[PDB]
Design a protein around this motif. Structure first.
Motif, PDB file in Angstrom:
ATOM      1  N   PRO A 299       0.792  -1.232   0.000  1.00 40.75           N
ATOM      2  CA  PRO A 299       0.000   0.000   0.000  1.00 40.75           C
ATOM      3  C   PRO A 299       0.824   1.282   0.000  1.00 40.75           C
ATOM      4  O   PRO A 299       0.325   2.345  -0.375  1.00 40.75           O
ATOM      5  CB  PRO A 299      -0.854  -0.145   1.260  1.00 40.75           C
ATOM      6  CG  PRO A 299       0.040  -0.926   2.175  1.00 40.75           C
ATOM      7  CD  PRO A 299       0.593  -1.983   1.254  1.00 40.75           C
ATOM      8  N   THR A 300       2.082   1.181   0.413  1.00 44.81           N
ATOM      9  CA  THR A 300       2.959   2.347   0.465  1.00 44.81           C
ATOM     10  C   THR A 300       3.721   2.581  -0.839  1.00 44.81           C
ATOM     11  O   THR A 300       4.419   3.582  -0.978  1.00 44.81           O
ATOM     12  CB  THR A 300       3.981   2.220   1.614  1.00 44.81           C
ATOM     13  OG1 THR A 300       4.736   1.012   1.452  1.00 44.81           O
ATOM     14  CG2 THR A 300       3.267   2.185   2.954  1.00 44.81           C
ATOM     15  N   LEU A 301       3.590   1.653  -1.782  1.00 49.32           N
ATOM     16  CA  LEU A 301       4.256   1.772  -3.075  1.00 49.32           C
ATOM     17  C   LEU A 301       3.233   2.027  -4.163  1.00 49.32           C
ATOM     18  O   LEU A 301       2.229   1.327  -4.250  1.00 49.32           O
ATOM     19  CB  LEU A 301       5.018   0.492  -3.428  1.00 49.32           C
ATOM     20  CG  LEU A 301       6.266   0.145  -2.619  1.00 49.32           C
ATOM     21  CD1 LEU A 301       6.899  -1.109  -3.208  1.00 49.32           C
ATOM     22  CD2 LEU A 301       7.251   1.312  -2.649  1.00 49.32           C
ATOM     23  N   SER A 302       3.485   3.023  -5.002  1.00 49.75           N
ATOM     24  CA  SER A 302       2.548   3.301  -6.081  1.00 49.75           C
ATOM     25  C   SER A 302       3.194   3.952  -7.290  1.00 49.75           C
ATOM     26  O   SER A 302       4.165   4.704  -7.180  1.00 49.75           O
ATOM     27  CB  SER A 302       1.406   4.191  -5.591  1.00 49.75           C
ATOM     28  OG  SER A 302       1.795   5.552  -5.567  1.00 49.75           O
ATOM     29  N   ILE A 303       2.633   3.640  -8.449  1.00 51.15           N
ATOM     30  CA  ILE A 303       3.086   4.184  -9.713  1.00 51.15           C
ATOM     31  C   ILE A 303       2.379   5.526  -9.872  1.00 51.15           C
ATOM     32  O   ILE A 303       1.182   5.572 -10.146  1.00 51.15           O
ATOM     33  CB  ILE A 303       2.703   3.241 -10.860  1.00 51.15           C
ATOM     34  CG1 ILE A 303       3.585   1.989 -10.796  1.00 51.15           C
ATOM     35  CG2 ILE A 303       2.825   3.956 -12.187  1.00 51.15           C
ATOM     36  CD1 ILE A 303       3.208   0.906 -11.793  1.00 51.15           C
ATOM     37  N   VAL A 304       3.122   6.610  -9.686  1.00 56.27           N
ATOM     38  CA  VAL A 304       2.554   7.944  -9.781  1.00 56.27           C
ATOM     39  C   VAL A 304       2.398   8.446 -11.209  1.00 56.27           C
ATOM     40  O   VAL A 304       1.672   9.409 -11.451  1.00 56.27           O
ATOM     41  CB  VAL A 304       3.400   8.966  -8.980  1.00 56.27           C
ATOM     42  CG1 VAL A 304       3.396   8.593  -7.504  1.00 56.27           C
ATOM     43  CG2 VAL A 304       4.825   9.008  -9.513  1.00 56.27           C
ATOM     44  N   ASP A 305       3.066   7.791 -12.157  1.00 55.92           N
ATOM     45  CA  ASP A 305       2.981   8.205 -13.550  1.00 55.92           C
ATOM     46  C   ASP A 305       3.516   7.111 -14.466  1.00 55.92           C
ATOM     47  O   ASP A 305       4.539   6.488 -14.178  1.00 55.92           O
ATOM     48  CB  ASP A 305       3.770   9.504 -13.747  1.00 55.92           C
ATOM     49  CG  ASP A 305       3.414  10.218 -15.036  1.00 55.92           C
ATOM     50  OD1 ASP A 305       2.242  10.138 -15.466  1.00 55.92           O
ATOM     51  OD2 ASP A 305       4.297  10.880 -15.611  1.00 55.92           O
ATOM     52  N   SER A 306       2.809   6.870 -15.562  1.00 56.40           N
ATOM     53  CA  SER A 306       3.217   5.850 -16.526  1.00 56.40           C
ATOM     54  C   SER A 306       3.081   6.378 -17.959  1.00 56.40           C
ATOM     55  O   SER A 306       1.977   6.636 -18.434  1.00 56.40           O
ATOM     56  CB  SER A 306       2.359   4.598 -16.337  1.00 56.40           C
ATOM     57  OG  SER A 306       2.764   3.568 -17.217  1.00 56.40           O
ATOM     58  N   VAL A 307       4.209   6.544 -18.641  1.00 60.29           N
ATOM     59  CA  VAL A 307       4.200   7.047 -20.016  1.00 60.29           C
ATOM     60  C   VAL A 307       5.123   6.201 -20.899  1.00 60.29           C
ATOM     61  O   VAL A 307       6.013   5.523 -20.395  1.00 60.29           O
ATOM     62  CB  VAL A 307       4.633   8.531 -20.042  1.00 60.29           C
ATOM     63  CG1 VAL A 307       5.952   8.690 -19.317  1.00 60.29           C
ATOM     64  CG2 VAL A 307       4.721   9.033 -21.471  1.00 60.29           C
ATOM     65  N   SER A 308       4.913   6.236 -22.211  1.00 66.53           N
ATOM     66  CA  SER A 308       5.733   5.434 -23.124  1.00 66.53           C
ATOM     67  C   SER A 308       7.045   6.049 -23.611  1.00 66.53           C
ATOM     68  O   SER A 308       7.120   7.236 -23.912  1.00 66.53           O
ATOM     69  CB  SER A 308       4.916   5.026 -24.344  1.00 66.53           C
ATOM     70  OG  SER A 308       5.741   4.324 -25.260  1.00 66.53           O
ATOM     71  N   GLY A 309       8.078   5.212 -23.695  1.00 68.87           N
ATOM     72  CA  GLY A 309       9.378   5.659 -24.167  1.00 68.87           C
ATOM     73  C   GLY A 309       9.772   5.005 -25.487  1.00 68.87           C
ATOM     74  O   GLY A 309      10.882   5.206 -25.979  1.00 68.87           O
ATOM     75  N   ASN A 310       8.873   4.211 -26.062  1.00 69.53           N
ATOM     76  CA  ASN A 310       9.138   3.539 -27.336  1.00 69.53           C
ATOM     77  C   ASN A 310      10.449   2.763 -27.418  1.00 69.53           C
ATOM     78  O   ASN A 310      10.984   2.602 -28.510  1.00 69.53           O
ATOM     79  CB  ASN A 310       9.135   4.553 -28.484  1.00 69.53           C
ATOM     80  CG  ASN A 310       7.747   5.000 -28.861  1.00 69.53           C
ATOM     81  OD1 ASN A 310       6.899   4.183 -29.237  1.00 69.53           O
ATOM     82  ND2 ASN A 310       7.499   6.305 -28.771  1.00 69.53           N
ATOM     83  N   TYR A 311      10.960   2.275 -26.291  1.00 67.54           N
ATOM     84  CA  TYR A 311      12.234   1.546 -26.284  1.00 67.54           C
ATOM     85  C   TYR A 311      13.307   2.380 -26.991  1.00 67.54           C
ATOM     86  O   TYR A 311      14.246   1.844 -27.586  1.00 67.54           O
ATOM     87  CB  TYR A 311      12.103   0.188 -26.994  1.00 67.54           C
ATOM     88  CG  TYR A 311      11.233  -0.835 -26.290  1.00 67.54           C
ATOM     89  CD1 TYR A 311      11.427  -1.141 -24.941  1.00 67.54           C
ATOM     90  CD2 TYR A 311      10.226  -1.515 -26.981  1.00 67.54           C
ATOM     91  CE1 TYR A 311      10.643  -2.101 -24.294  1.00 67.54           C
ATOM     92  CE2 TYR A 311       9.433  -2.480 -26.345  1.00 67.54           C
ATOM     93  CZ  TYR A 311       9.646  -2.767 -25.005  1.00 67.54           C
ATOM     94  OH  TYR A 311       8.864  -3.716 -24.376  1.00 67.54           O
ATOM     95  N   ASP A 312      13.172   3.699 -26.913  1.00 68.37           N
ATOM     96  CA  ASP A 312      14.110   4.603 -27.571  1.00 68.37           C
ATOM     97  C   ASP A 312      14.768   5.545 -26.559  1.00 68.37           C
ATOM     98  O   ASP A 312      14.091   6.150 -25.732  1.00 68.37           O
ATOM     99  CB  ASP A 312      13.361   5.406 -28.640  1.00 68.37           C
ATOM    100  CG  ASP A 312      14.265   6.319 -29.433  1.00 68.37           C
ATOM    101  OD1 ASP A 312      15.052   5.814 -30.261  1.00 68.37           O
ATOM    102  OD2 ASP A 312      14.190   7.544 -29.230  1.00 68.37           O
ATOM    103  N   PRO A 313      16.103   5.685 -26.618  1.00 68.93           N
ATOM    104  CA  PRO A 313      16.839   6.559 -25.698  1.00 68.93           C
ATOM    105  C   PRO A 313      16.440   8.032 -25.782  1.00 68.93           C
ATOM    106  O   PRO A 313      16.265   8.700 -24.760  1.00 68.93           O
ATOM    107  CB  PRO A 313      18.299   6.347 -26.103  1.00 68.93           C
ATOM    108  CG  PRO A 313      18.304   4.963 -26.692  1.00 68.93           C
ATOM    109  CD  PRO A 313      17.033   4.951 -27.497  1.00 68.93           C
ATOM    110  N   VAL A 314      16.306   8.543 -27.001  1.00 71.27           N
ATOM    111  CA  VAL A 314      15.950   9.944 -27.180  1.00 71.27           C
ATOM    112  C   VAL A 314      14.530  10.202 -26.702  1.00 71.27           C
ATOM    113  O   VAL A 314      14.297  11.119 -25.920  1.00 71.27           O
ATOM    114  CB  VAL A 314      16.090  10.377 -28.659  1.00 71.27           C
ATOM    115  CG1 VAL A 314      15.808  11.858 -28.793  1.00 71.27           C
ATOM    116  CG2 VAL A 314      17.507  10.070 -29.155  1.00 71.27           C
ATOM    117  N   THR A 315      13.589   9.381 -27.164  1.00 67.24           N
ATOM    118  CA  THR A 315      12.191   9.516 -26.762  1.00 67.24           C
ATOM    119  C   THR A 315      12.094   9.481 -25.235  1.00 67.24           C
ATOM    120  O   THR A 315      11.400  10.292 -24.618  1.00 67.24           O
ATOM    121  CB  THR A 315      11.336   8.360 -27.330  1.00 67.24           C
ATOM    122  OG1 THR A 315      11.397   8.383 -28.760  1.00 67.24           O
ATOM    123  CG2 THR A 315       9.869   8.491 -26.879  1.00 67.24           C
ATOM    124  N   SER A 316      12.809   8.538 -24.630  1.00 68.93           N
ATOM    125  CA  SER A 316      12.793   8.376 -23.184  1.00 68.93           C
ATOM    126  C   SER A 316      13.335   9.587 -22.425  1.00 68.93           C
ATOM    127  O   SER A 316      12.780   9.975 -21.385  1.00 68.93           O
ATOM    128  CB  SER A 316      13.571   7.112 -22.800  1.00 68.93           C
ATOM    129  OG  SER A 316      12.962   5.970 -23.381  1.00 68.93           O
TER     130      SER A 316
END
Lengths: 274, 274
Positions: B157-174
C-alpha cells in the motif's frame, strides 16, 4: 546493542553462510551479534529464543526448525516489545514483524521452465518425467518451492511429476530415498532437488546405481554443487543470497526502530548457475 | 538449407545480440543464415516474411513490431510448409509454431521486489513513488512487464506508480518523456524502465536536470547499462539471454521436423544484475 540469531544448525553450508552474513551485517549496523545453533533440536531452539528474551536483546532473527513449536516463545518476545524477524524460512505469526527469504515460489517456477528447455535441448523430446525430492515438510520454504514448480508445469501437458518424496534437506536421507525411486524401476528424465544438500545425495544415488544422462537441479549455490555443475555432473543450481537476506533484514529492523510501516515480507534475488 | 530472421531494427543493442546469436546458432546447426531488418516498418516486415517464403527457406524466425499486421503473411509461410518461430516478442497465431522469450511478467515482478527493497535500504522509508516509462504500446512484452510489476507491488500500500508514459524503447524519446515528467513537478523516488535503452534516456534526463538519488532500473543487460550500474550511476537491470532464446528456438525447430508435439511457448532465464 545486541541482536540474537538462532538457526537450525551448523551443518548446512547455506546455514553457515547465513551465520557469517549475520555476523558481518550486525557489525556493519553497530550491533553485537549473538549466534545460537539448535543443532536440529526444537527444544534447544525454543530455549534459545527464550534466552534472548531473558537477555532483553534489541531483536531476534530466526531460521526455524518448526515455526509452530516456537509460537509461544515468539509471543513472549512480542510481549516484551522485542521485534522478531524470520530469515530464509517464513514464520506466520503476529509476533513476527517481517520474513526475509528468497522468492521460493519464483525459484520453483524458474527451475521448471529450465528443466523444460533442457529436456528439449538435451534429449530432443517434449515429454518430461520428473522426480521431486522435497525438503523437510511443514517448512514454508519447502511448500513454496513445491508450489512454484507445480505452477511452472501445470499448463505443460508434456511435463509431469512421477514421484515425490522428502529428502529433508539432508544428503544421507536424500541418497537413500533416491535409491528407492531407482529400485522402483519408475522411469524418469529429471530430478528436482529442493536444495543442494539433497542434490549431493541424489548424485550419490545416481552414481552408485550407474545412472547418467538425467537432468539434475538444486538450490543454494553451495561450493560442492557449483563444482558439480562446472564438471557437468549436474545441470544447475539456484544461488541464494545469505548476504542480501541479512542486509534487507537489518534494514527492516532500522525501519522498526523508526516506528515505520514494515512490509510483511521481503524477497531477495537469486541467480541460476549452470 | 536456410533459416530467415526478420527483426524490427538494427539499433537496439539487444536486437544486435539477437542477430549475433541467430547467426552463431544457425552456423552451429549447419544452416545458412539470412537476416533482414524492417526499421520499425510493418510494411517491410510483411514483405520480408513473404520474401523468405518465396526463397523457400527452411524456417523463419520473427521479432515483430505488430504480430497482427503480419498475420496473413505468417499464414502464407504455413501454407508453404515453412515453420515460423517468434523470438523475444510473442506472436499470437496458430500459424506460429512457438514463441521463445524471457518470462516478461517474472521480470516485472523481480524489478518490483528489487525497488521495494532498495527504497528501504537507501531511503530508510517504506513509502515509494514510482514513475514507469514503458516500451511500444499494446505489444506483448510491454503489457507483460507492466502487469508483472503491478503484481509485484499489489500488496504494498505504500508503493505506487505515480505516472506511466511510453518511451518507445528509444533513448531519445525516453529522455524527452522523462524530462517532461520532471517538468510536471510530480514527486518520485524511482523509475521503472521497460528496457535499457529507455534507462539510457532516463539517466540522461536526470543528469541534465541535476536530480540525484533516484533508484533507476532497466531490462536487457546491455553493456552500457551493466557498466552504468557498476559505477552506481544506475541501480540494476535484468539480463536476458539472446543466446538461450536461439538455442531453444533451433532445438524446437528440430522437434517440429520430427513431427513432435511442441509447447506453444518457452521461457528463457533472466536474472537481476546488481
Amino acid at each position: 546493542n545486541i541482536v540474537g540469531f538462532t538457526i537450525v544448525n551448523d551443518k548446512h553450508e547455506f546455514a553457515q553462510r547465513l551465520i557469517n552474513a549475520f555476523k558481518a551485517e550486525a557489525k556493519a549496523n553497530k550491533y553485537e551479534a549473538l549466534v545460537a545453533t539448535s543443532q536440529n533440536s526444537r527444544i534447544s531452539e525454543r530455549e534459545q529464543i527464550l534466552e534472548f528474551v531473558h537477555l532483553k536483546v534489541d531483536a531476534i532473527f530466526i531460521t526455524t526448525l518448526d515455526d509452530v513449536y516456537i509460537g509461544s516463545a515468539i509471543e513472549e518476545a512480542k510481549k516484551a516489545g522485542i521485534p522478531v524477524f524470520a530469515i530464509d524460512r517464513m514464520i506466520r505469526s503476529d509476533a513476527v514483524v517481517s520474513s526475509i527469504t528468497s522468492n521460493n515460489q519464483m525459484i520453483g517456477e524458474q527451475l521448471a521452465s529450465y528443466i523444460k528447455n533442457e529436456l528439449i535441448k538435451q534429449t530432443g523430446r517434449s515429454t518430461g518425467r520428473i522426480v521431486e525430492i522435497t525438503g523437510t515438510a511443514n517448512v514454508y520454504t519447502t511448500n513454496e518451492r513445491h508450489r512454484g514448480f507445480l505452477k511452472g508445469i501445470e499448463n505443460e501437458p508434456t511435463l509431469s511429476i512421477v514421484d515425490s518424496v522428502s529428502g529433508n534437506y539432508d544428503p544421507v536421507t536424500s541418497e537413500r530415498v533416491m535409491r528407492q525411486v531407482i529400485d522402483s524401476g519408475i522411469p524418469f528424465d529429471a530430478v528436482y532437488c529442493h536444495n543442494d544438500d539433497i542434490a549431493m545425495g541424489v548424485l550419490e544415488a545416481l552414481k552408485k546405481a550407474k545412472i547418467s544422462g538425467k537432468i539434475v537441479v538444486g538450490i543454494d549455490g553451495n561450493r560442492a554443487i557449483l563444482e558439480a555443475v562446472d564438471m557437468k555432473s549436474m545441470d544447475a543450481t539456484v544461488v541464494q543470497s545469505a548476504e542480501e537476506m541479512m542486509k534487507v533484514a537489518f534494514s527492516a529492523l532500522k525501519l522498526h526502530t523508526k516506528n515505520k510501516k514494515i512490509p510483511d515480507r521481503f524477497y531477495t534475488y537469486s541467480y541460476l548457475y549452470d
